[PDB]
């Protein structure tokens, strides 16, 4: 339980639908100039406390690609390999994507709708053929060429699911590299990351709903030789602007 | 008969460039120029529908961009892509950073013409006194290559970059495009023209003379033993095309 491997997370910055009270989840949305700026952000730390990566995970969305390069390009280290998995993607949402609270609450009851956003293990109703954004995310052949088919993606997922369909990339991929001594980023959403803290630091079914996850923030996380985290996750850079970010994802 | 599409490309040029200065393994960033060939590179593989299943580049900077940026006006951000030291630019050795008259002065008018048009005359070893040799080779991407640091080449012919590239084509790229992916290789002045001579079978005589535009799509034809049929193929406006053909003539 001594502190052995170093890994760096954190969460690109969130957009306008987000501003909105939507879910963006799987819909491929580019990062805004705010999003462009809190990754910029994030290298200028990262090299400000000099460090240095030798392999980068994000999802297949863009967004947390992006945050990637321009973490890369910030630190010169564009030639660091990058890998994309649709199991570091943001949390499905389902047939909520898009909506606000009020539509949500709406369509399918003020009970359910808690359950959804809150809750650790309540699944949203699946996205169906009629969503109007079904199409943009089913016919994008990047889902075409993951390690499982197309059909057997989620159409919804709870933060359970997210956790259950991450741990897997986590085990097969990511730490193996960490237990080898490589120093790894991770380009991750709201949930992704939430999903891997929650293994990473044993939190409870109970306690993960709260936990403050700020974005363009970069999140240290101390691991022992049965990479469990030794102490809590440490946001890095200046508490000010830290406490700007932690107020941004309140709830 | 064709049977598999390859496309290529090389970065566009920097200051050095129109100086007579060889970059080389000088990991130069792109200039404002470079940057706008590689997005409109970008729009015009967009505006012919190409969807690419893998991206190789070198562990050059301005190879990687040129990629990224590509990838960005496509929408293909999700797709892998793979560095590697073998689609380097020609290592020019002790001629790193030196213009034609500084090259003539220290090494004699005849040598330099050979090292510069000859297919296989190596330039003289790079060696630790030269201004360029540290920012290489204490650069920490060539302790993680393929061969160790002490092995990697302190300057090359045209003949040595093809034959360090070949065990890439052969053992990496190669296999993919049997797979049926379609392949782009973001790489360089003499990377391309290395792999090029291979595929085409073009002589050590001719090879010197074919003309290679920066920013533009190179279509390679390729047959069941990856032998091409019938020449490269310059894609886009052909106005584009003869004013790159024009910037590499004249320069």
């Given at each position: 339980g001594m502190s052995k491997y170093k890994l760096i997370m954190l969460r690109h910055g969130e957009g306008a639908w987000n501003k909105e009270n939507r879910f963006c989840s799987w819909v491929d949305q580019k990062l805004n100039s705010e999003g462009m700026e809190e990754a910029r952000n994030c290298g200028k730390q990262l090299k400000a406390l000099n460090f240095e990566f030798d392999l980068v995970f994000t999802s297949v969305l863009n967004r947390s690609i992006h945050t990637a390069w321009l973490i890369l390009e910030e630190l010169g280290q564009e030639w660091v390999p990058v890998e994309s998995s649709?199991?570091?993607?943001?949390?499905?949402?389902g047939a909520l994507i898009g909506l606000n609270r009020e539509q949500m609450a709406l369509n399918h009851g003020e009970e359910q709708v808690r359950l959804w956003r809150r809750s650790y293990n309540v699944t949203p109703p699946p996205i169906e053929?009629?969503?109007?954004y079904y199409q943009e995310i089913y016919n994008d052949r990047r889902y075409k060429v993951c390690d499982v088919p197309l059909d057997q993606l989620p159409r919804s997922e709870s933060l359970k699911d997210v956790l259950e369909r991450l741990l897997p990339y986590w085990n097969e991929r990511i730490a193996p590299e960490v237990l080898r001594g490589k120093t790894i980023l991770i380009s991750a959403h709201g949930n992704s990351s939430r999903a891997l803290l929650k293994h990473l630091e044993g939190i409870s079914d109970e306690d993960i709903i709260n936990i403050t996850l700020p974005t363009g923030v970069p999140i240290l996380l101390e691991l022992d030789e049965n990479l469990r985290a030794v102490g809590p996750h440490q946001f890095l850079g200046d508490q000010e602007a830290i406490q700007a970010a932690i107020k941004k994802v309140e709830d």
């Amino acid at each position: 339980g001594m502190s052995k491997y170093k890994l760096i997370m954190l969460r690109h910055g969130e957009g306008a639908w987000n501003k909105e009270n939507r879910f963006c989840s799987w819909v491929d949305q580019k990062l805004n100039s705010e999003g462009m700026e809190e990754a910029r952000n994030c290298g200028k730390q990262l090299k400000a406390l000099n460090f240095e990566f030798d392999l980068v995970f994000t999802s297949v969305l863009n967004r947390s690609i992006h945050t990637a390069w321009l973490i890369l390009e910030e630190l010169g280290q564009e030639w660091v390999p990058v890998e994309s998995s649709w199991r570091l993607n943001e949390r499905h949402y389902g047939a909520l994507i898009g909506l606000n609270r009020e539509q949500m609450a709406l369509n399918h009851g003020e009970e359910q709708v808690r359950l959804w956003r809150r809750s650790y293990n309540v699944t949203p109703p699946p996205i169906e053929e009629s969503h109007p954004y079904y199409q943009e995310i089913y016919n994008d052949r990047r889902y075409k060429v993951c390690d499982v088919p197309l059909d057997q993606l989620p159409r919804s997922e709870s933060l359970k699911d997210v956790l259950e369909r991450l741990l897997p990339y986590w085990n097969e991929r990511i730490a193996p590299e960490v237990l080898r001594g490589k120093t790894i980023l991770i380009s991750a959403h709201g949930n992704s990351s939430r999903a891997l803290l929650k293994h990473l630091e044993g939190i409870s079914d109970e306690d993960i709903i709260n936990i403050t996850l700020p974005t363009g923030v970069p999140i240290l996380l101390e691991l022992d030789e049965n990479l469990r985290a030794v102490g809590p996750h440490q946001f890095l850079g200046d508490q000010e602007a830290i406490q700007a970010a932690i107020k941004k994802v309140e709830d």
